[model samples]
Target: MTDLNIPHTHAHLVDAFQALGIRAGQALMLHASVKAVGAVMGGPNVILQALMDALTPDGTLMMYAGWQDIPDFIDSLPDALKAVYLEQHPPFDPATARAVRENSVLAEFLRTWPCVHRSANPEASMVAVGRQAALLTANHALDYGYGVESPLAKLVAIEGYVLMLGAPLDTITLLHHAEYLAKMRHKNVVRYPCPILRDGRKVWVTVEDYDTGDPHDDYSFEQIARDYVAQGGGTRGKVGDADAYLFAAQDLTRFAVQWLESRFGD
Candidate 1:
């Protein structure tokens, strides 16, 4: 096997992050793909340290930690089987539930790191570690997972930054928060079932979120994200062998909401 020769170390990653304009004391939410970043001396752990070193003590780091089992594929199941599945479904244990791997390895590492705080929302949870961890993740709303009460909303409110380190703009979740704020005649919502612990027992819970996945429901954010970069709303660079982008959370959200309204409004 050929060694791609793209080896990165902690210091190298820190240099890359600095070149990408990650400033000290800035609140940050990072979406990263380890594979895209190439081989590191210590893997995700070193990448995590580089992020920590970049942010410093006054800054906070956040990542999406949505449970892997929420949106059950029960639509095609028999009624009895669906009932049985929900009845036996495991409750969302934030400490143990694995994050959707699509978010990548760095997110899972951060989610389980010591001193991290994870939200209680059964489906769309977020994890944070730093000075403002509790403030960002506390009392996440069960419905409208990316709306006003969620961490994504709070990140925008605080004028934080979003970094896509070796990840694509399509994975920028801040746009979903913007979807909740867009003023349009037609809005999309999805209903799915999961289990949450209530009164020391597992209980079925239904979650509602703006439909961000289906093209039929949400606008084409991939195009919007590309346009945003093209229009200079974001800065792009390389971290290791992978492409990276940085954007002000407020700017991204504001533009996205406006774009959504202008393109889809009544």
Candidate 2:
């Protein structure tokens, strides 16, 4: 039999959701550390249960579950090439890379969710996961890029919001929105080939020279985000290893709209 106190933790979780302003049907970039809540809590499963309960049947939750092949890619490289790359930039060892490469927890859960994505490089950085998670959460239309028409983009763009449990506003992964946009402003196209799992097999999905033109007003988005940061909307705790926060769809939209207007209108 399960411990009896789970119900209490469940209730607290719900209360936390309420405090965070989460609602059903919103998309969340869930970052969690099961230990942060309490030892009695049932780890990842309990937190997932609480989120599902709070979200009800119609809500959607997404987590970062990318398994990077960096280790293998590095290992397969000739030793000389590896040394050259490492001479310029430190390289990740195969073992450490593999550990993050094979994290199956979130990947398994993503099977049933309408919105989810795992990045190609899991060991890149927490900020990387946070950024990708927010993009995936927003349904992938973040500027104009290869993933614009992706299924994940559709869900996040419509009726979408982001929830981060333990991270602060500064820890928001969405900052990449500005970064990606800024890069595109100077360069009209970006290309990358990533490994994607389909039908239980790994396949390389090449985004061949995708166009990401300037957003309506790239400068303003940066300013608002910078202002938000300057105003102390920073330092959120990560539920897992990154950070967390709760966001409303309207608030996110407002930020996007104002950002556009700042560039295009009075």
Candidate 3:
């Protein structure tokens, strides 16, 4: 753990990232702790600008912006069961709760990055393409998924680069794309039939479960690594908290192949 006397703000961190080779035409996935970073050094706009400048022209960035759901959990019939459930899936009232999404600091930062595609949906709101694109949100807890129309999905399908920062590579934001593939395979998953209203005039959608056993049990680490390689993953590498091992594109490909064969072949 690194501790600095000064308030570790977003601005300062972004500045550091900018200096650390994050530049335009690069895709990045960010995992952050507001408390850990303290006050952003350059502030929200500056941080956003730093990232934008780094991945401008044609780079893409994604983030985890899941909003916790409390009402549904609390309102459940069996209070005890609800309590247990809530324990596993914490609640986050973005529209009302001040601790998180509603926080003035974060709120203002998010304003600079708006959601255009799924504005009708809260989960999709933070996932729009612009400056800040968050992956997680309230819908992740209750909805279990978002519409395919989202840019997040499109970017993944198009074989976009995924740069993970402040989080583990295992923290894959493109999991939904794999889920989408499961949907095509007739796996038991969730989907929307139409749009509905929630916090606002959002899309009222219906969730349909796929009929093909349990998708959860089917996903494997080997499969994930395999898919990652197929999608042009390992294009770039850097030294960071996670292993700090810089792998060339071909090296990543070889590693993924060997890993799968070693684990699943036997």
Model 3 spans with C-alpha error above 4 angstroms:
5-29, 34-40, 43-46, 57-60, 70-108, 112-119, 123-125, 129-148, 182-186, 190-205, 209-215, 218-266
lDDT computed for candidate 1 = 0.83
* lDDT measured at residue 110 in model 2 versus the true structure, 0 to 100: 45
Which 10-residue span in candidate 1 carries the lowest summed lDDT?
Answer: 210-219
lDDT of candidate 3 over 15-78, digit per residue (tens): 5555555655554544333343344445444445555556673655554444333233234348
- Our tally of clashes for model 3 stands at 24
Each prediction's number of clashing residue pairs:
0, 14, 24
In candidate 1, what are the lDDT values of residues 231-263, reduced to their tens digit?
988788898878999899999999988888788
Q: List model 2 lDDT by residue over 1-266, tens digit each.
A: 74333333666666566555666655555544433444435555656767767776566565443334433244457989865543443233212332232333433444434433333332222211222344543333222332433323333455455555543333333433333323232434544444434565545444443332333333533466556546544233323322355554335544644554455444
Steric clash pairs (candidate 1): none
* Comparing 2 and 3 on TM-score, the stronger one: 2
Local error of candidate 3 at residue 225 (angstroms) = 6.0
